[PDB]
């Protein structure tokens, strides 16, 4: 019989793994694509240092992750383990955004 | 007839450049005049702070048996001190990762 | 060659060998420490300028540097920073 | 020349990876598009300022140092790219 | 029988009143006493401008009131109407206090 | 002169007033002491800052300008006191 | 023998003091020189912002039938404008109060 | 004998009578306006100072101020301020 | 002998010609005498209204992704501002077209 | 050989680049603007003349023009036009 883990066990191992890891979790070139797409909405045909793209990737991942710890706090504060977009809206409203 | 040009960091027994920091204050436009002991005091404060953060970083690298300090070790050091994290809560380290933290309700029975 | 670009590599390396002769340093972590020291430096410079403005002081001296580091740094970090700076100020005062 | 859909380039498994880094055990299906919108908001907020810096620098190439300026403007100072 | 409002009606009316009002919700003299009590612990024989104590006041109700809308958002997130101190703790920690 | 527990000088009905200005409907009995501790932390931080201003000012008396400097140090700027 | 005195605020056609803002910027230590149009531009911006917020406060006062601007009027004017709220999300006002605001679940039935 | 103290009273009162000739004002509201106009003055001034540092310019021009307005003031107030300030700069240029 | 000539539009700092408008009012048979500030006031209000309709036209063109304003943009701008709409309800624009407007029962179902 | 003909193109061009540096213009849109400025000028001038006849005032001042624009321009447009013209006549008075 092919093994199947009970749910969340792999999720917890993922949590341990990616808390242990330091690297970026976003695909680099699609992120560059989206950054340039937002950029042309302000000024077209600009050039980018790849360092600027990596800095934006780091800051974006950090802001997202901190938002997710706040979301996790809200969800467990609501006595749930599944996060919801309303949790994110709550967290952003608490942060003053 | 000049004396030997001695260095003010050695005069205060310090590592950080007194002259460079004084030049930065003179050209950073914070006042037109700067008291002489002020960059010395600033450099000493900075040396103290760098000493503690580097010491914690080396301790963390030793804990991870690593002989060359890592930005991961910098994150682990800066976040595991209460006063340092209260000093630098809004500041992010590139490639720092996150603290290992799982809520107890997330943990299984 | 090119123009000189300022860096804090040598001083941080000396301080590292003061606290840990045995261990090494990565250059990206070196960039992190440069960002750190520049950030703290510009912070303290800012509150020094503000406090000198509040007392309408044309000269920035060590006493409000002490005030600002006591203001920003939390607790025993601030007190030991005061201690280290006071020691260095006395030693430079004695040349 | 133009770009039309790269917000979907931030795929669902990448958001899952970020959430596992965020300590999230379970993720709803409604999460991903809202996080895409939130990410879009944060990125546009920083990059409008970055464009402002770069144009004020009279450059057409975006530099990381301006990204540092923009991030520390919005209270989100990043270590590892200064200078 | 005597008149008696059902629970929450008086609360609604006083919420409307105090949102409409701007006047201080703290008795001034014990507030000044507490300010002197805390300040003596840090430096002896401290004297106060009364205006300084008042500014300390509106700062106090400002921070506290904003904390209670954060708490109310947490409570309505938690499907409750009665706030509990862990809601305040959540608001402080998500703000990063 | 020496004061002992003026933290309870912030009465429970005053806390109810503050909650109603925040639109809070129902308040637990556990709330008041916890909020007293929270406001204690807030006040001790800001008065530490304001004091440090005051002895740096070489003054014995706290001024409101020192207070507003302390609040703007914390990103909690207050208007209307000569700032 | 000498030209008659004419203000630079009038030279811009503005009310906000050009000379005062120029002196404050010079003594505020932001750069060792300053462009001539910079303080004029600054005073124009502050005059525009003051005028628009005074308009909003005037509307708030007229809606509550009061002739004079009140800090309550200022609070209502600023907090009901999402642009000015995002300008001043971290600004507190003395004796300002808050928006009259209730949650729908707090209302009966 | 009293030393003279600075305020924005005449300017705010005249612009109030421009925007609303029939509307009065309370004095502590004027104190709030004093704090507001001062606060925005150091916000724009500090932004202009650091932007002058970043391009290594020792002279802050209207371009720097306009850039700072685009930074701190979001959306429509920024572009309206740009238009009115450009008009003012143009009228000063004619002056 | 003679100072450099300064135009009254520049003295006002507004773009519309004060001298041209004053000459038009002198030769337009409206009064035997005209107060000096009256054509200035006229030029100011004209430049305000042209400025605002030019904002509306520029927004319309940018919404239509066009660099240059066209009479269709003028139609769309002037009909969607109610004060401007009833200001020019009886005023017709060359090649303006009409607003996109369909009555409710004209739609199916 | 031709005869010089008056138009308002260049002033509207300065106004357009003041409000939108990035936005162009078609010339027939400028013809519509020329009809606009001539028509509104004629309306205000005729109202001013008839008002000057009503009070038997042989001179039209900015008070009369203010009255006329308050009559024809509604409300929001009226109050902002009044503000702009008041500022303009004030700074002209200082000149």
Residue numbers in the entry:
A (entry chain E), E (entry chain A): 37 to 133
B (entry chain C), G (entry chain G), I (entry chain Q): 10 to 118
C (entry chain D), H (entry chain H), J (entry chain R): 30 to 124
D (entry chain F), F (entry chain B): 20 to 102
The authors write:
The zig-zag arrangement is observed also in our 4×207 structure, in line with observations from in-cell mapping of DNA contacts. In all structures, nucleosomes 1 and 3 form a canonical stack, whereas nucleosome 2 is located in a DNA loop between the two stacking nucleosomes and is rotated relative to the nucleosome stack. H1 is absent from the stacked nucleosomes of the 4×177 array, but is present on nucleosome 1 in the 4×187 and 4×197 arrays, and is present on both stacked nucleosomes in the 4×207 array. Particularly high Δβ values are found for entry DNA at nucleosome 3, except for the 4×207 array, which is the only array where H1 is observed on nucleosome 3. In summary, as the NRL increases, nucleosome 2 moves farther away from the stacked nucleosomes and the trajectories of linker DNA at nucleosomes 1 and 3 progressively approach canonical values (Δβ = ~0). As a consequence, H1 can contact linker DNA, explaining H1 binding to stacked nucleosomes in arrays with longer NRLs. We find that longer NRLs are required to enable H1 binding to all nucleosomes of an array, thereby stabilizing nucleosomes and inhibiting chromatin remodeler activity.
